[PDB]
């Protein structure tokens, strides 16, 4: 199949809120092996973000029930078994994305912005895997999400302006990895504060077209600092 056709189909799927269909169209585009455009990269990312996001949300609800049903034998057993089936689905999806990242997207990325976007994505999906890891596997998974975020972060610090939404979105997600996954409120507030401040100092130079995206992510960084220092 023709790549343009697959992209038009993925756009229709998005409008129809049919994210499994969207992700399958964009996985087919990625597997033809040409470097994706920004447009195509963003459609791949929106499709998998919704596919994995549904399972994360389900997993949180069933985890919570499994905690709240301690001393309720039937219910807790069934919530455990259901939780384990949703984890299997969520792992398959993350492993799918992580394979696309390694085999196509990261090697093909010609520009630092796209490198950063995909290494951040790799951090994120290893972070999703870390949320559901077996006790034995967890340290190793957490260190894989940290190494991808850190690699993205050193590239973005050298190559992108502090106001760029992809560098700000990396600082957001990597600071949440520090607070939620590494349980480091210090590294989390340090990263979020520094990113916010470095942006503040370049707002005068920011192109008007980016005012909204940049300052929205800066507000989310500060909302987390506020929360985490409370």
């Amino acid at each position: 199949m023709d790549k343009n056709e697959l992209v038009q189909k993925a756009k229709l799927a998005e409008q129809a809120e049919r994210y499994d269909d969207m992700a399958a169209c964009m996985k087919s585009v990625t597997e033809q092996g040409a470097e994706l455009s920004n447009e195509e990269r963003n459609l791949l990312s929106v499709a998998y973000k919704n596919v994995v996001g549904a399972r994360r949300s389900s997993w949180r609800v069933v985890s919570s029930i499994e905690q709240k049903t301690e001393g309720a034998e039937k219910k807790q057993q069934m919530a455990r078994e259901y939780r384990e089936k949703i984890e299997t689905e969520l792992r398959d999806i993350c492993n799918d994305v992580l394979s696309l990242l390694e085999k196509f997207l990261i090697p093909n990325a010609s520009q630092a912005e796209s490198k950063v976007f995909y290494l951040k994505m790799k951090g994120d999906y290893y972070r999703y895997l870390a949320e559901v890891a077996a006790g034995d596997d967890k340290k190793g998974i957490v260190d894989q999400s940290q190494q991808a975020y850190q690699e993205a972060f050193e590239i973005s610090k050298k190559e992108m302006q502090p106001t760029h939404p992809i560098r700000l979105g990396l600082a957001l997600n990597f600071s949440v990895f520090y607070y939620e996954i590494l349980n480091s409120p210090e590294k989390a507030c340090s990263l979020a504060k520094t990113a916010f401040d470095e942006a503040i100092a370049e707002l005068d130079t920011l192109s008007e077209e980016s005012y909204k995206d940049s300052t929205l992510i800066m507000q989310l960084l500060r909302d987390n600092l506020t929360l985490w220092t409370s």
Binding site: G169, N173, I217
Partner: peptide, 10 residues
């Protein structure tokens, strides 16, 4: 649709 594609953590 960059902000959506960024998969921002909350």
């Amino acid at each position: 649709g960059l902000l959506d594609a960024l998969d921002l953590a909350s």
